[PDB]
Amino acid sequence: MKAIAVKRGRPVVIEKPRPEPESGEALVRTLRVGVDGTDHEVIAGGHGGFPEGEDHLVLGHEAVGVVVDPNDTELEEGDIVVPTVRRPPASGTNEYFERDQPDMAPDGMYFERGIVGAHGYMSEFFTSPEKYLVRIPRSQAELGFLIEPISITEKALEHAYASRSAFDWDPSSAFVLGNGSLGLLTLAMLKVDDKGYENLYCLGRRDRPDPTIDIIEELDATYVDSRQTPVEDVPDVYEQMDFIYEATGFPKHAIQSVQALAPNGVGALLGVPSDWAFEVDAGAFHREMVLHNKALVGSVNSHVEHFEAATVTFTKLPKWFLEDLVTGVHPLSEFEAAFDDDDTTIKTAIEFSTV
Amino acid sequence: MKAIAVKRGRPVVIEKPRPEPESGEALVRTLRVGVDGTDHEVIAGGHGGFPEGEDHLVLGHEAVGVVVDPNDTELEEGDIVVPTVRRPPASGTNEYFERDQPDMAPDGMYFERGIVGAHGYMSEFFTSPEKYLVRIPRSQAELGFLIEPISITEKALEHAYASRSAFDWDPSSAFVLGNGSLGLLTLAMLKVDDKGYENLYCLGRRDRPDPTIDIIEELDATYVDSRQTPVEDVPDVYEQMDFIYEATGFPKHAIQSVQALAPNGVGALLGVPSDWAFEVDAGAFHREMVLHNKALVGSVNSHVEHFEAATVTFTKLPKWFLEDLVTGVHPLSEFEAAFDDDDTTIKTAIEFSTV
Ligand SMILES: NC(=O)c1ccc[n+]([C@@H]2O[C@H](COP(=O)([O-])OP(=O)(O)OC[C@H]3O[C@@H](n4cnc5c(N)ncnc54)[C@H](OP(=O)(O)O)[C@@H]3O)[C@@H](O)[C@H]2O)c1
Numbered sequence: 001m002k003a004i005a006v007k008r009g010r011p012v013v014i015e016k017p018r019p020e021p022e023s024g025e026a027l028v029r030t031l032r033v034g035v036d037g038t039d040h041e042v043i044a045g046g047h048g049g050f051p052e053g054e055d056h057l058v059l060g061h062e063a064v065g066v067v068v069d070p071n072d073t074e075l076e077e078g079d080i081v082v083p084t085v086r087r088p089p090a091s092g093t094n095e096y097f098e099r100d101q102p103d104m105a106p107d108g109m110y111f112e113r114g115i116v117g118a119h120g121y122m123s124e125f126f127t128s129p130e131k132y133l134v135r136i137p138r139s140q141a142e143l144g145f146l147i148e149p150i151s152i153t154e155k156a157l158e159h160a161y162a163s164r165s166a167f168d169w170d171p172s173s174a175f176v177l178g179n180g181s182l183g184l185l186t187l188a189m190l191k192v193d194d195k196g197y198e199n200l201y202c203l204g205r206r207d208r209p210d211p212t213i214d215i216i217e218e219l220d221a222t223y224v225d226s227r228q229t230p231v232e233d234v235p236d237v238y239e240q241m242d243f244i245y246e247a248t249g250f251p252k253h254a255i256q257s258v259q260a261l262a263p264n265g266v267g268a269l270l271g272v273p274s275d276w277a278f279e280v281d282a283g284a285f286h287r288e289m290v291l292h293n294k295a296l297v298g299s300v301n302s303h304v305e306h307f308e309a310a311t312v313t314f315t316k317l318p319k320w321f322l323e324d325l326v327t328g329v330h331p332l333s334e335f336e337a338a339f340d341d342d343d344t345t346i347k348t349a350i351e352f353s354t355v
Numbered sequence: 356m357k358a359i360a361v362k363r364g365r366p367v368v369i370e371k372p373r374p375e376p377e378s379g380e381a382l383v384r385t386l387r388v389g390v391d392g393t394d395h396e397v398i399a400g401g402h403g404g405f406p407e408g409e410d411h412l413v414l415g416h417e418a419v420g421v422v423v424d425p426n427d428t429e430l431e432e433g434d435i436v437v438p439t440v441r442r443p444p445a446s447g448t449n450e451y452f453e454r455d456q457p458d459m460a461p462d463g464m465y466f467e468r469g470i471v472g473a474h475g476y477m478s479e480f481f482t483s484p485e486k487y488l489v490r491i492p493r494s495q496a497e498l499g500f501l502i503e504p505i506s507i508t509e510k511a512l513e514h515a516y517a518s519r520s521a522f523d524w525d526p527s528s529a530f531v532l533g534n535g536s537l538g539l540l541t542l543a544m545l546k547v548d549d550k551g552y553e554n555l556y557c558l559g560r561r562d563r564p565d566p567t568i569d570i571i572e573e574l575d576a577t578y579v580d581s582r583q584t585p586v587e588d589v590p591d592v593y594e595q596m597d598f599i600y601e602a603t604g605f606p607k608h609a610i611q612s613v614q615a616l617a618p619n620g621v622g623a624l625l626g627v628p629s630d631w632a633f634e635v636d637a638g639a640f641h642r643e644m645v646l647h648n649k650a651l652v653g654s655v656n657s658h659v660e661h662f663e664a665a666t667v668t669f670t671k672l673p674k675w676f677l678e679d680l681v682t683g684v685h686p687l688s689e690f691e692a693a694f695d696d697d698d699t700t701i702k703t704a705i706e707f708s709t710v
């Protein structure tokens with residue numbers, strides 16, 4: 001079978017044996033795999049996450065496929081499934097996997113397929129334990145690779161909202177930092193969230209005309225240009241935000257969100273920045289956190305329950321939105337195009353097979 | 356009646372009319388009032404919190420008293436009560452008070468008796484609406500002024516634990532930053548907490564011999580000298596902490612706690628520092644928060660439910676502890692002694708009357 005990978009030393013096509021499902025696993029024929037920032041990181045230089053003893057890493061962690069061999073599992077041929085990303089590390093299972101919370105496992109206690117220590121999903125076929133395969137409605141198969149990123153936000157919201165559960169919290173405004181695939185998906189999710197947000201805002205740093213600015217305004221949200229208005233200045237210009245969702249990977253934002261939050265608000269952090277120091281007014285951060293009962297919660301990955309919730313959220317998203325968000329689905333024959341990234345490309349995917 | 360106050364321009368005795376209870380209020384005869392850091396701040400220069408049109412501020416927010424006139428409330432003569440601290444601002448009630456969550460009210464939407472905008476409890480008598488008077492067991496009357504500070508921690512724990520409620524969290528280690536009255540009370544509370552902590556730690560910066568170090572070690576906790584081991588170095592020397600409770604008011608601690616927290620841990624911030632900037636590695640803060648699913652939650656004040664929970668916690672605290680924590684209860688005749696603060700004085704109170 002063909003797979004798209006990065007060899008130790010740009011993405012290329014590689015040939016490898018079709019895997020065979022061990023007991024408890026099913027054989028899945030890949031349909032479409034989304035391309036994400038992490039995939040670009042790898043194609044960049046992030047060759048650390050390579051599997052032990054391997055000279056290549058098959059890419060892709062956002063996938064959807066069809067079950068071709070149920071083997072001894074309770075799945076059925078033809079079921080449309082989306083795989084979870086985390087798997088037990090080389091040293092075997094542990095408490096996080098035992099108790100079914102691998103998304104809470106710390107560094108070194110897991111592998112993430114297509115990201116660290118284990119091959120991804122950009123291959124014609126792949127296998128996975130039945131417990132990590134989530135059945136989704138057949139009609140979501142075409143954009144099924146979007147279930148995983150929607151999963152990410154379902155988890156982040158669950159933890160952020162749980163932090164405000166000891167009192168009567170009724171938010172009205174939400175602010176998403178970042179106009180990438182995750183931030184835009186999240187803005188649309190907040191538009192339909194049961195918390196009933198009235199005013200939505202999204203931070204970016206693009207000049208018009210720009211398709212991300214267009215999606216933001218079509219969702220009826222307010223586009224905030226960080227070059228004109230820093231996060232901490234937002235309350236002066238617009239309003240204090242009950243809920244902030246950080247998806248930029250810019251450290252200043254994690255600190256400054258505290259000044260933009262309304263009293264009793266919570267900020268969910270999803271960005272993954274590298275070390276970077278700078279002068280911060282920590283007394284202001286510290287005091288606002290305390291005197292205004294605020295919270296900052298970090299979240300990474302997600303698990304089965306979030307993928308299931310994602311299928312419901314998916315049906316509520318505007319159809320025009322899903323069309324404008326996915327800028328290109330490319331056949332394997334033209335896979336390289338899926339990795340060209342410019343301001344006008346938002347979410348791309350590679351199509352391996354159909355039906 | 357006599358009251359202890361600070362006049363615009365050290366604490367002194369002042370004479371004022373005994374108040375009369377309006378409808379819905381009871382008249383309380385003060386028994387004992389604890390002295391706290393805020394009281395010292397006022398005696399320092401914090402004369403901003405003075406009541407409008409008043410040239411003095413009666414001190415004290417940690418009090419216990421006996422009901423002498425139930426007026427038209429459902430309280431009974433002789434009931435032992437502890438008052439809550441927050442009251443509606445001059446501009447009348449608002450949603451926070453309407454819904455019974457004044458502890459969540461933002462700046463400017465409340466007064467705190469003895470702290471900002473309203474007179475405290477260091478007077479022979481005081482009144483208060485029945486809804487803000489919490490009945491406590493008669494036998495807790497002698498150290499009843501401790502219910503309010505215990506209240507503070509009951510609320511902070513409730514919010515911090517609520518932030519970890521979306522997954523199976525089972526902490527084993529807890530770290531209290533600060534060896535003041537609030538930190539020491541909190542360390543004893545964690546010793547008996549239902550979460551079953553196995554290893555307790557407390558941060559201070561005192562040289563032996565010191566009575567705060569003695570309380571820490573008698574509770575079977577480990578004393579950590581911040582001059583020898585900074586918060587961020589703690590995991591190297593001892594272990595990562597599942598739960599951190601910050602009660603130092605030192606901004607570096609709020610930032611550094613993130614590096615000391617174990618994966619999936621939460622830090623509760625209670626300190627109130629002034630503005631102070633400095634170089635921080637925000638990328639390290641940001642990334643650890645996200646990749647290890649951590650949370651930081653701020654908390655201030657507390658309300659009725661927490662004062663009620665405090666009465667149960669009080670009975671579980673070691674008797675030797677309560678004896679060592681309260682370094683002096685001084686009769687009104689010698690009130691000034693209650694404000695002398697040195698390393699060997701931990702918690703003091705002023706006794707206005709008995710029984
Ligand atoms: N914790 C998790 O589970 C998880 C999962 C997926 C992704 N993430 C992280 O989430 C972040 C967002 O990922 P994505 O897939 O949406 O990433 P992305 O495609 O890189 O998008 C980030 C977006 O934020 C914008 N941005 C960066 N700095 C900005 C600034 N100072 N002001 C305004 N906009 C700014 C970028 O704008 P320009 O294009 O104009 O530079 C870009 O559009 C990344 O850090 C990623 O690592 C975390």
Ligand SMILES: NC(=O)c1ccc[n+]([C@@H]2O[C@H](COP(=O)([O-])OP(=O)(O)OC[C@H]3O[C@@H](n4cnc5c(N)ncnc54)[C@H](OP(=O)(O)O)[C@@H]3O)[C@@H](O)[C@H]2O)c1
Binds near residue numbers: 391536603624
């Ligand atoms: N949010 C709320 O509702 C609330 C309620 C009450 C109090 N607070 C705040 O909570 C904090 C603690 O108050 P308290 O009544 O316990 O205050 P406190 O009596 O001032 O005690 C703070 C303690 O922390 C220690 N400390 C300060 N910096 C330190 C450092 N770098 N390393 C080690 N120890 C350090 C001090 O040690 P030394 O004596 O050796 O300097 C002191 O013993 C204050 O900031 C107060 O404003 C908040």
